[PDB]
Amino acid sequence: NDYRTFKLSLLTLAPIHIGNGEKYTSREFIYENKKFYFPDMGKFYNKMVEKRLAEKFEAFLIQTRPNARNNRLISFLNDNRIAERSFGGYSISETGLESDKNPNSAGAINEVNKFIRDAFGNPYIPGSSLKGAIRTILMNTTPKWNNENAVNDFGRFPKENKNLIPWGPKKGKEYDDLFNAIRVSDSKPFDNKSLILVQKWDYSAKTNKAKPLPLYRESISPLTKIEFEITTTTDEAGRLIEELGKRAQAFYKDYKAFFLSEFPDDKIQANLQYPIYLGAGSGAWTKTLFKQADGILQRRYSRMKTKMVKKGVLKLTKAPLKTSLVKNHESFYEMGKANFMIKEI
Amino acid sequence: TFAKIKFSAQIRLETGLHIGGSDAFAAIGAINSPVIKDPITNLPIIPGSSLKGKMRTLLAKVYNEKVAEKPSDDSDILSRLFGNSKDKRFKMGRLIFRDAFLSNADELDSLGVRSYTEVKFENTIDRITAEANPRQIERAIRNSTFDFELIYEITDENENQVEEDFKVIRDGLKLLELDYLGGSGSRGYGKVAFENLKATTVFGNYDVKTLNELLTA
Amino acid sequence: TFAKIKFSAQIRLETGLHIGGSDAFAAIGAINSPVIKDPITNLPIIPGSSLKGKMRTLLAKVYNEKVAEKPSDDSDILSRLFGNSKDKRFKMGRLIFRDAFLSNADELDSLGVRSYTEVKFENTIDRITAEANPRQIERAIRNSTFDFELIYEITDENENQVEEDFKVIRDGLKLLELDYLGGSGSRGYGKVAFENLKATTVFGNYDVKTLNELLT
Amino acid sequence: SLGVRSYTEVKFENTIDRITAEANPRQIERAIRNSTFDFELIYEITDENENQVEEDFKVIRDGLKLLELDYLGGSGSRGYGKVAFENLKATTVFGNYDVKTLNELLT
Amino acid sequence: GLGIKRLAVVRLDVDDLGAAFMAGFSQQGNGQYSTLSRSATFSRSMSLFFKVYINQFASDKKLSIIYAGGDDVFAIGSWQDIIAFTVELRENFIKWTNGKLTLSAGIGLFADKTPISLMAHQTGELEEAAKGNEKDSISLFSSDYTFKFDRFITNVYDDKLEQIRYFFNHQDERGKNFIYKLIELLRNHDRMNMARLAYYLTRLEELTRETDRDKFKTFKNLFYSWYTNKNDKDRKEAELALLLYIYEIRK
Amino acid sequence: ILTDENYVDIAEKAILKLERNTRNRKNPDAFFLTTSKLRNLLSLTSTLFDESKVKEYDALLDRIAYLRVQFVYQAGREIAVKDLIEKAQILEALKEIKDRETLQRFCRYMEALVAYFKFYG
Amino acid sequence: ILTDENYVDIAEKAILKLERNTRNRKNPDAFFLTTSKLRNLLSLTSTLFDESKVKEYDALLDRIAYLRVQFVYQAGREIAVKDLIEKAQILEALKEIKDRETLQRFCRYMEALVAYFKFYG
RNA sequence: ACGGAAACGCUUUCUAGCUCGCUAUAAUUACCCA
């Protein structure tokens, strides 16, 4: 048969956070111990409204009282002595090191972004996330797919053409569609005991410091092998999937000589397999054709938080060190570093 | 003579599917690409057209020698099962598919399911200026199963052509375990498992004791 | 003596039914295959002629001897039941298929039914160049029941072929429960089922009570 | 007042051969559902008429019992019928003969 | 098999034959030309046309001139030959009578085995509807497809119908369905159907094989030219020309 | 305001009054407005117009309320559709519907707009 | 309150009533409220609008009951969101949700607010 | 002593056949404000 299957096994060096759109707020979790409890807040409200206490809950939510210890809905339940914790939702244990602040102030996390999930209650990694990470490798390592794929100044000129890849029905022409012929399937959904909720940590050049950010996305625990399939249907696509194991290294070599250099070696990790940069935290130089988006990306940021010159910030996190998967102290990962190996089946 | 038999397969979903439908009054910030669902039960259907016209292309790249370029050009190993409409003697079907209604609307509520579809958020990262373009495509969830009935006709025009055709029905029903079953496809959305391929006659008298062995192979 | 045997039944749908009406030019974004509709209430309608034609060609696959060249080239058991245009004694013979008129037009509305005809969007993928030609084709609701009746009239000419014909009529209803009754039936439309079969004499006198046992 | 556009509908229909399986379409113009029609039926009473009128009315009303079971129209074996009768009153005009025993044979 | 299985009937008639015999010649001059010799000569000329020479015009054709002469002609026959025979009779009677003495046919299309009294009366009603259309008309087939002989012969039967045959019998994509939908849009005809046809022809223009597209482009620009011409005289010609073409190509 | 004699002519000389693309001389004198950003507005009114025959007006007066939501939202996303509803006066054809025959008239107005948009490139 | 034939207009002149920057003449009449917080308001109600298509009111009224507290909390974060729920009567309209056919109407009111925000600046 | 009397424009006929709602698409980007 023409359908030459594959088997991708992926590995988490740095934590990976993927989409889900929604996020909890400062008053949507419980923190009784090393577990953060994330309940179904509709059912929390439905149990708590029985005491006629919800009007008190109307006062607590707009209450910008200081000393964040008493702002995070644990003090609401430690105050009005609601003592069940029998609500729905999921409850994940702590990263243990994303609370740079003083002990017992700790637990004052603010805005947590959910991981993508299917409806049974487990998480997974979508096939479309891996497929969009694969497409950047295949677009930045094929040297015919970097030069003319730009704006040509049609509108205000920021936009790409998006036609330089075989795309579409295209009247009269035989059906080409290279990326129809690369069919990445979804991952086998794992369990919530590999999620740690890292905090974002920005490590800039020209002010050599690691100022953290108040954005605490959920993520994947490091050293987790994840199953995937790439079942092609054209031998032209079979060439690209066979050369993934070399094009990933070539992409990383044209990356590390370009952006990871001018940032010190201790913040960088090793590879141990072939390298890939999965979504949400890797920055806009793994989501882009970066060798042509150096002068077009920085035009968009004419706002209060412009990029510092070009190639402005490197994104790190804080996870438990599991190995040693680092090469430095204080556990600064890369937030999106992952490593895969491929094989025909 | 005239008989008619029936395949009671069960499409189990594996990383479930999204058969699209178009709605002009959807929302602003909600579903803009919904699964096609039944109007009165609001369960997602796998309609029979997306099964039939998927098996048609699967077996049309396989059971053809001349490159087809159209239906009404298949090599009559297909067109006596799926029907042409330009050949004279093969206008009618001989295969009657069905819509695949969702069986386990209660073995899904046994698990922690609060809606029989799941809405996936799916941005489009512009490779220059890094900007997104979100969407919300709806899809039916993983552990669904769908009662898939398929009906095969038998007249006195099948001199020796009955048991040949189950090398076409089993070929389609384990090439759909290779293909995606309509959907985004190259982003997941397809893989399925036709459990319990259990043929039985429903009109006429026919021996299917010889038939149930080339289905469990 | 002379009698009429009305066959009250209900056509409960499954995999909702499309029976085409006008082939007229659909508006620019509108429904391309409109279903047939009662002009007063705009509800769906199964006509009696779909119910006659499909049942005709289903019993003809069973009750012939040779393959017929036309509906007039049928047997003696089907020409007396349906009607032969050629014979001198089989014109207008033994069956009036009345229409079917959406009995539960409000039990659907006690559930969550917006309107009584869904619009299934659909397409076709070309083999060479893989384009797409969509179509917005219309079909009735999955759990409608239409009102089926057949005035099987006895003629005082058979008088022992009465029960002989109901082994044919219940066979035709079994075949309609197996075949599709109008529309794109190899793409899973149609699929009728017949709730509450009941034969009842409306004129004359016959023993229909010894005859509902086969209907059951 | 029930809301309708034109008084006759056009039922589209076809014919399918049992050899070629080829269609052959028809258009049948049809008077639409739940229209009423002013039906009336003079029955004249005369001298020779007398003493049998009792079996002219278990036949007339046995005849109107039949039209609600047979079709009254062309192509009636494919629908196109089901005529019902209502307000079936038997008045009298130009005569001296009561009808108010007949009027409960009907209604 | 290129025909519909019908038979047509034409009842021609000279318009104002009585006005051609009472006055006749007194229009030219001062009442000095309506004389006896010219009257007898014109009468012999018209009987010589309508009784002898109809056999020459109907020599090869598959028809049957039932009654002919004076003014009135009543001819049954096969329908292509009937229509061509009326065309030849008018195109020789204006050559005969110099463009004076307009005649008025009315053609009716009939199935087989219909009686030739239900046929003759419907053709007579068609013919008097043609005479009441104007002084000269041919009423093809129906009481609404009324034309002029000056316009049916040139524009409908030889200009438009040969353009539709020249277009359609070159290609192998558009079949009977496109022609049927074209007649449907020509018969329904509100103003919105001009926009629906503008969408339909432009949609089908780029649906074709892209090699031979300008065949369809010069057809569709021409069809939209004689849909929206806004004279009411170039639209019914297109409808009847497509009726005659679908009649000619019926299997 | 649009009535039964002019709502196709209004659509014709409202598509013609629209402004053309300056650059892109491959297929030049073409429109800014892509076909999708207009088919995804006729998609609303086509499924209205197929429902106006079945349903009464006073059970279909939430969909017409959503019309003025969606036309305003598609206008505020790109300048092309904003220019469309300012040229072909669609908002001032949406305050004035109020009954069934005017709703079908507005649906046929939208259809005439799409038809003449497909006609002129 | 809001019925089917007013909620767009009620949502129209609300955005005409919203305050703007009195200072800062850079795209003047720029609001104090931005598109992101209004979308973060609408994302509370979108899932409810889908579950009012699929499910019933009875398995849903607890989600509606929490949605009021969601709007309460989003009011207490930013002064412009504290005012938008007062110009457009949102908390006045959340008290009156008695049906599927009122919840869908409230979600169309939220979408009308977002549409008329996007149309204006 | 009604150019009248008697007389169903009626029988037979599936809107039917064929056709994947499909093609591309990482829920992500930027770095801070009081």
Side-chain angles (χ1 to χ4, degrees), chain E residues 79-134:
Chain E
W79 77 265
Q80 302 100 16
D81 295 7
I82 280 291
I83 293 184
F85 159 69
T86 62
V87 161
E88 204 152 23
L89 209 158
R90 197 257 177 189
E91 291 297 324
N92 290 319
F93 195 73
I94 53 153
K95 289 185 64 185
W96 189 271
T97 44
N98 215 345
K100 274 89 69 172
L101 260 78
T102 52
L103 57 84
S104 77
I107 308 187
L109 197 74
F110 298 95
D112 213 354
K113 303 181 190 65
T114 174
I116 303 104
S117 279
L118 187 53
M119 177 189 286
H121 168 243
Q122 286 172 354
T123 311
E125 283 287 272
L126 271 157
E127 180 249 331
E128 64 94 17
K131 284 170 68 176
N133 142 37
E134 292 297 312

Side-chain angles (χ1 to χ4, degrees), chain C residues 11 44-48 51 98-103 145-149, chain D residues 82:
Chain C
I11 312 176
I45 169 176
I46 300 184
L51 286 152
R98 294 277 160 81
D99 274 355
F101 266 125
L102 196 50
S103 80
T145 61
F146 293 85
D147 279 311
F148 192 43
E149 61 204 40
Chain D
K82 214 195 286 176

Side-chain angles (χ1 to χ4, degrees), chain F residues 93-97 99-110:
Chain F
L94 275 170
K95 275 82 171 178
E96 309 158 353
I97 291 184
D99 52 347
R100 158 191 295 220
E101 326 288 331
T102 318
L103 162 70
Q104 302 182 330
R105 192 193 309 138
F106 173 65
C107 290
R108 276 178 229 119
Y109 176 50
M110 194 85 203

Side-chain angles (χ1 to χ4, degrees), chain F residues 61-63 65-66 68-69 72-73 75-77 82 85-86 91 95, chain G residues 4-5 7-9 12 39 101 104 108 111-112 114-116 118-119:
Chain F
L61 77 168
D62 53 355
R63 301 215 173 282
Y66 187 85
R68 206 176 145 219
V69 171
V72 158
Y73 179 58
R77 283 186 43 188
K82 178 177 183 211
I85 73 162
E86 286 289 331
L91 292 181
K95 275 82 171 178
Chain G
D4 311 314
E5 63 259 15
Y7 62 70
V8 187
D9 268 7
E12 174 187 47
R39 293 316 290 240
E101 285 266 327
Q104 285 162 1
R108 308 303 168 99
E111 289 143 351
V114 178
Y116 265 101
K118 184 66 70 68
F119 190 40

Side-chain angles (χ1 to χ4, degrees), chain C residues 23-29 131 133, chain E residues 180-181 184-185 192 196 199-200 203:
Chain C
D23 77 316
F25 212 88
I28 289 152
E131 312 188 18
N133 212 10
Chain E
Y180 182 87
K181 288 191 188 324
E184 155 178 341
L185 294 196
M192 184 61 204
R196 277 191 212 182
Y199 179 53
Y200 180 51
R203 197 189 72 217

